[PDB]
């Protein structure tokens, strides 16, 4: 369980900051709304593959959305292929990536799904899918990136340099893209040290989260309603 832990208590987190007055109050508040939590690998990767596992673990046993998710995932393909990336070049992460979706269908246990988030070679062809689809996503709709988070930005040279390569960390432009890329709804809990509110944002704002994560120290860790 060394990229997706098991599950613990959401207070077992204190001990990441002892002493330490605003994380204590802050990871308290948390205790009132969420019960549990599961920590990632700080790797660069944390984003990509949280949202994989805990977004496929909400899928498990609903036949219905587990079969309207299949039908976007299998129309991905047409997404790379108009932004210029190359059948065979996508072609092992695809197909990784549409195995563990099967696998929601036809075994549906949440200890196989672990095991593929915590296979280095699976679960990084898996994010690496993902870094592919956001960066696809981003270029196909350029004018609304740029008219709605950066007039000034190059977008070419953004996906290029902080989305395709493993290891590249995140901000809201990856997170809006790869919700609208995959239509999966997310809220993201902050926890920095200034002497402020807990806070959140949804991913996107009018929607109901099926993914909580939270933000602490530039790493992203799951948490549990
Ligand atoms: C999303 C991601 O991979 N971020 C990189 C990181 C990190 C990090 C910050 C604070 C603590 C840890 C520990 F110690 F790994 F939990 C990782």
């Given at each position: 369980?060394?990229?997706?832990?098991?599950?613990?208590?959401?207070?077992?987190?204190?001990?990441?900051?002892?002493?330490?007055?605003?994380?204590?109050?802050?990871?308290?508040?948390?205790?009132?709304?969420?019960?549990?939590?599961?920590?990632?690998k700080?790797?660069?990767?944390?984003?990509?593959?949280?949202?994989?596992?805990?977004?496929?673990?909400?899928?498990?046993?609903?036949?219905?959305?587990?079969?309207?998710?299949?039908?976007?995932?299998?129309?991905?393909?047409?997404?790379?292929?108009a932004?210029?990336?190359?059948?065979?070049?996508?072609?092992?992460?695809?197909?990784?990536?549409?195995?563990?979706?099967?696998?929601?269908?036809?075994?549906?246990?949440?200890?196989?799904?672990?095991?593929?988030?915590?296979?280095?070679?699976?679960?990084?062809?898996?994010?690496?899918?993902?870094?592919?689809?956001?960066?696809?996503?981003?270029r196909?709709?350029?004018?609304?990136?740029?008219?709605?988070?950066?007039?000034?930005?190059?977008?070419?040279?953004?996906?290029?340099?902080?989305?395709?390569?493993?290891?590249?960390?995140?901000?809201?432009?990856?997170?809006?893209?790869?919700?609208?890329?995959?239509?999966?709804?997310?809220?993201?809990?902050?926890?920095?040290?200034?002497?402020?509110?807990?806070?959140?944002?949804?991913?996107?704002?009018?929607?109901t989260?099926?993914?909580?994560?939270?933000?602490?120290?530039?790493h992203?860790?799951?948490?549990?309603?």
């Amino acid at each position: 369980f060394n990229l997706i832990s098991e599950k613990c208590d959401i207070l077992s987190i204190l001990r990441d900051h002892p002493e330490n007055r605003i994380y204590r109050r802050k990871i308290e508040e948390l205790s009132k709304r969420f019960t549990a939590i599961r920590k990632t690998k700080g790797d660069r990767n944390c984003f990509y593959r949280a949202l994989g596992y805990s977004y496929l673990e909400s899928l498990l046993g609903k036949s219905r959305e587990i079969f309207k998710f299949k039908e976007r995932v299998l129309q991905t393909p047409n997404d790379l292929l108009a932004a210029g990336f190359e059948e065979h070049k996508f072609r092992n992460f695809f197909n990784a990536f549409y195995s563990v979706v099967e696998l929601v269908e036809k075994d549906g246990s949440v200890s196989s799904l672990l095991k593929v988030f915590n296979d280095q070679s699976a679960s990084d062809h898996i994010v690496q899918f993902l870094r592919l689809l956001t960066s696809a996503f981003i270029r196909n709709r350029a004018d609304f990136f740029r008219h709605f988070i950066d007039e000034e930005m190059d977008i070419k040279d953004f996906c290029t340099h902080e989305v395709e390569p493993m290891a590249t960390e995140c901000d809201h432009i990856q997170i809006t893209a790869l919700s609208q890329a995959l239509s999966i709804a997310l809220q993201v809990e902050y926890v920095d040290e200034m002497d402020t509110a807990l806070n959140h944002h949804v991913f996107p704002e009018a929607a109901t989260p099926s993914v909580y994560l939270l933000y602490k120290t530039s790493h992203y860790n799951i948490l549990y309603a």
